[PDB]
Design an enzyme around this catalytic site. Structure first.
Site, PDB file in Angstrom:
ATOM      1  N   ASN A  46      41.931 -29.902  -0.539  1.00  0.00           N
ATOM      2  CA  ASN A  46      43.322 -30.262  -0.385  1.00  0.00           C
ATOM      3  C   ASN A  46      43.553 -31.041   0.881  1.00  0.00           C
ATOM      4  O   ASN A  46      42.801 -30.929   1.841  1.00  0.00           O
ATOM      5  CB  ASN A  46      44.189 -29.010  -0.395  1.00  0.00           C
ATOM      6  CG  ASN A  46      44.068 -28.236  -1.690  1.00  0.00           C
ATOM      7  OD1 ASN A  46      43.696 -27.062  -1.700  1.00  0.00           O
ATOM      8  ND2 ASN A  46      44.378 -28.896  -2.803  1.00  0.00           N
ATOM      9  N   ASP A  48      45.712 -30.621   3.173  1.00  0.00           N
ATOM     10  CA  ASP A  48      45.901 -29.775   4.338  1.00  0.00           C
ATOM     11  C   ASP A  48      44.603 -29.171   4.893  1.00  0.00           C
ATOM     12  O   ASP A  48      44.637 -28.391   5.848  1.00  0.00           O
ATOM     13  CB  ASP A  48      46.924 -28.679   4.025  1.00  0.00           C
ATOM     14  CG  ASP A  48      46.428 -27.653   3.020  1.00  0.00           C
ATOM     15  OD1 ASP A  48      45.348 -27.795   2.441  1.00  0.00           O
ATOM     16  OD2 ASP A  48      47.140 -26.675   2.792  1.00  0.00           O
ATOM     17  N   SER A  50      42.424 -27.102   3.247  1.00  0.00           N
ATOM     18  CA  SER A  50      41.971 -25.949   2.514  1.00  0.00           C
ATOM     19  C   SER A  50      41.318 -26.463   1.236  1.00  0.00           C
ATOM     20  O   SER A  50      41.417 -27.646   0.916  1.00  0.00           O
ATOM     21  CB  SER A  50      43.144 -25.048   2.212  1.00  0.00           C
ATOM     22  OG  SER A  50      44.044 -25.743   1.373  1.00  0.00           O
ATOM     23  N   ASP A  52      40.247 -25.256  -3.041  1.00  0.00           N
ATOM     24  CA  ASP A  52      40.522 -24.342  -4.137  1.00  0.00           C
ATOM     25  C   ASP A  52      39.200 -23.994  -4.781  1.00  0.00           C
ATOM     26  O   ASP A  52      38.365 -24.876  -5.022  1.00  0.00           O
ATOM     27  CB  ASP A  52      41.444 -24.981  -5.138  1.00  0.00           C
ATOM     28  CG  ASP A  52      42.739 -25.380  -4.532  1.00  0.00           C
ATOM     29  OD1 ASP A  52      43.275 -24.632  -3.707  1.00  0.00           O
ATOM     30  OD2 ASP A  52      43.230 -26.457  -4.888  1.00  0.00           O
TER      31      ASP A  52
END
Length: 129
Positions: A46, A48, A50, A52
């Site tokens: 992502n 930001d 982070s 998944d």
């Protein structure tokens, strides 16, 4: 591992997801399809920072620890790699916590945009389970 539709539906049922928190089985299967394409090893990074992880694409900022997401809260107390396993137990167990969050399945953007309000029953039709 890449699951089959019916293969995954049964493994989720067996793990107690059918109607968990009010969301029938077809919801969970629909979500996995659009989230990871039934692939346990799927990962997506992502903007930001982070990432998944897994079949249900659980995020590293809140749920798991991947050792590279500062401000990580690791609510399911588990390393993110544990979510990429061919045994969906950890993903299922952490998913139960997320859905109990107070936001339901809206936590999964693919569920909200592609599963919510569709005949989700079509996802397990024809399956023995």
């Amino acid at each position: 591992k890449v699951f089959g539709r019916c293969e995954l539906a049964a493994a989720m049922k067996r793990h107690g997801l059918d109607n968990y928190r009010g969301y029938s089985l077809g919801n969970w299967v629909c979500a996995a399809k659009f989230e990871s394409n039934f692939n346990t090893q799927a990962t997506n990074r992502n903007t930001d920072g982070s990432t998944d992880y897994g079949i249900l694409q659980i995020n590293s900022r809140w749920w798991c620890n991947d050792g590279r997401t500062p401000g990580s809260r690791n609510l399911c107390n588990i390393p993110c790699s544990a979510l990429l396993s061919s045994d969906i137990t950890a993903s299922v167990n952490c998913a139960k916590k997320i859905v109990s969050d107070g936001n339901g399945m809206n936590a999964w953007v693919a569920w909200r945009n592609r599963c919510k309000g569709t005949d989700v029953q079509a996802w397990i039709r024809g399956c023995r389970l």
